């Protein structure tokens, strides 16, 4: 809205990373203090610094807050293993008559080397045919990272309806697994000759096909 | 001290202006500031709008 933030910033583990926040002349440039918060994906945000002059208890001295007139800046020294969150600008807005937050910046560069995927295709069982639906699942497992595109074909034309893709989660051995469903009906399930899932990972494409008859 | 008949030019006539107009526009532009007063609600005295 009134506060704009960059989408992402790049940095190195050991150099200074500085973020710039720009607002208007009635909320941040008017004279109000600013407050910075960290939005960890899974835990409630806490206070990092208030007023850019005092250090709250339990917060390291590594964070520095300054206000260069209309714009406020935050500087850090070194990237540890907990900066995988979002930074927001919070200041009192007189026009909104309340508190307004910023956009949010993501702090990550790269942590995902390559691996070899493997897929499996399982046709629906006999009890699923009487439910007036056809759920086609092609599971993908033992792959890294979790960025796999899913395409469905029926050996004559691609299927662009009912295609879904689930987000992958970390396995026990630091890998990823995912599944892809396809909503259909048993009326046209037997008419088609075969069904298959097609995926592509870093140029490696594998295909598995099942036969209902 | 003796002037004969004829035409004679003595000085020049200059019409000096008495008023000056220096206005460049007819009106200037404005910025949104009536919302400070024309608002649905105001603030308090411990925390007022700045
Ligand atoms: C506020 O609204 C009134 C009526 O709507 C209008 O006459 C006036 O010019 C506006 N601005 C101020 C500063 O009062």
Q: In terms of domains, do A70 and A145 share one? A: no
Q: What gap in Å lies between CA A129 and CA A135, rounded to an integer? A: 9
Report how far residue A163's alpha carbon sits from residue A40's, in angstroms, rounded to the nearest whole number: 31
Cα gap A46→A154, rounded to integer Å:
52
Task: Round to whole Å and give the CA distance between A52 and A89.
Answer: 12
Structure tokens at B46: 């411990």
Residue A3 in any domain: the answer is no
Ordered DSSP codes for A3-54: -B--SEE---BTBEEEEEEB--TTTTSSS--EEEEEE-BTB--EEEEETTTB
Q: Name the CA dihedral angle for A80, A81, A82, A86, rounded to a multiple of 10 degrees.
A: 80
User: Which residue does chain A place closest to B38, by CA atoms?
Assistant: A95
Indicate the DSSP class of residue B17.
-
Q: Does residue A68 belong to any structural domain of this protein?
A: yes
Q: Is the omega angle on the peptide bond into residue A205 within 30 degrees of 0, that is, cis?
A: no
Residues A102 and A123 in one domain: no
Give the span between the Cα atoms of A22 and A11, in whole angstroms. 20
| Residues of B with Cβ-Cβ distance to A30 under 8 angstroms | 50
Residue identified by tokens 């300054």 is A66
Range of the domain at A77: 8-108
d(CA A121, CA A137): 7
In a domain, A179, yes or no: yes
Resolution in A: 4.1
Q: A75 near A66, Cβ under 8 Å?
A: yes
**Biggest distance spanned by C-alpha atoms of chain A:** 75
CATH number of the domain encompassing residue A75: 2.60.40.10
The whole-angstrom separation of Cα A62 and Cα A181 is 47
Evaluate whether residue A2 is within a structural domain. Answer: no
Atom of ligand 1 nearest to the CA of B36: 13
Sheet of strand A16-21: strand arrangement = A16-21, A71-77, A64-68
Set of chain A residues whose Cβ sits within 8 Å of the Cβ of B38 = none
Q: Cβ–Cβ of B35/A31 closer than 8 Å?
A: no
Q: At which residue do the structure tokens 């910075």 appear?
A: A36
| A72 within some domain | yes
Last residue of a domain, one of A108, A143, A163: A108
The bridge status of strand A71-77 relative to strand A64-68 is antiparallel
Buried residues in B16-50 as b, exposed as e (16+ CB within 10 A): eeeeeeeeeeeeeeeeeeeeeeeeeeeeeeeeeee
Are A41 and A87 contained in the same domain? yes
Q: A32 in a domain, yes or no?
A: yes
* Helical H segments across chain A, by residue range: 186-189
Place of tokens 């070899």: A116
A62 and A154 housed in the same domain: no
Q: How far apart are CA A5 and CA A37, in angstroms?
A: 14
Using the Cα atoms of residue B22, residue B25, residue B31 and residue B36 in order, give the sign of their dihedral: positive
Number of domains chain A contains = 2
As a whole number of angstroms, the distance between CA A213 and CA A200 comes to 28
Residues A133 and A104 in one domain: no
* Domain termination residue (choose one: A63, A86, A108): A108
Domain contains A17: yes
Same domain, A45 and A103: yes
Kindly calculate the radius of gyration of chain A based on its CA atoms and give it in whole angstroms. Answer: 25
* CB contact (8 A) between residue B50 and residue A97: no
Rg, Å, chain B Cα set: 33
Q: Which two tokens stand for residue A146?
A: 């979790």
Domain-located, residue A1: no
Sign of CA dihedral A20, A80, A83, A62: negative
The Cα A101–Cα A194 span in angstroms is 53
Question: Tokens representing A80?
Answer: 């540890």
Q: Positive or negative, the Cα torsion across A65, A68, A70, A73?
A: negative
Residue that terminates a domain, selected from A89, A108, A127: A108
């Amino acid at each position: 809205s009134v506060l704009t933030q960059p989408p992402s910033v790049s940095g190195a583990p050991g150099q200074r990373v500085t973020i710039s926040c720009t607002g208007s002349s009635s909320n941040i440039g008017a004279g109000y203090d600013v407050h910075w918060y960290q939005q960890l994906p899974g835990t409630a945000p806490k206070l990092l610094i208030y007023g850019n002059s005092n250090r709250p208890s339990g917060v390291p001295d590594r964070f520095s807050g300054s206000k260069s007139g209309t714009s406020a800046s935050l500087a850090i020294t070194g990237l540890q293993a907990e900066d995988e969150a979002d930074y927001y600008c919070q200041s009192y807005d007189s026009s909104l008559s309340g508190s307004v937050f910023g956009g949010g910046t993501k702090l990550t560069v790269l942590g995902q080397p390559k691996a070899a995927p493997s897929v499996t295709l399982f046709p629906p069982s006999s009890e699923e045919l009487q439910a007036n639906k056809a759920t086609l699942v092609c599971l993908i497992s033992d792959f890294y990272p979790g960025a796999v595109t899913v395409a469905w074909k029926a050996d004559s034309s691609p299927v662009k309806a009912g295609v879904e893709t689930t987000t992958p989660s970390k396995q026990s051995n630091n890998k990823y697994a995912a599944s892809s469903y396809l909503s259909l009906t048993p009326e046209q399930w037997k008419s088609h000759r075969s069904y298959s899932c097609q995926v592509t990972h870093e140029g490696s494409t594998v295909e598995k096909t099942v036969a209902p008859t | 001290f003796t002037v004969e008949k004829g035409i004679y030019q003595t000085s020049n006539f200059r019409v000096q202006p008495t008023e000056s107009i220096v206005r460049f526009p007819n009106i200037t532009n404005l910025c949104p500031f009536g919302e400070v007063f024309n608002a649905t609600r105001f603030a308090s005295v411990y925390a007022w709008n700045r």
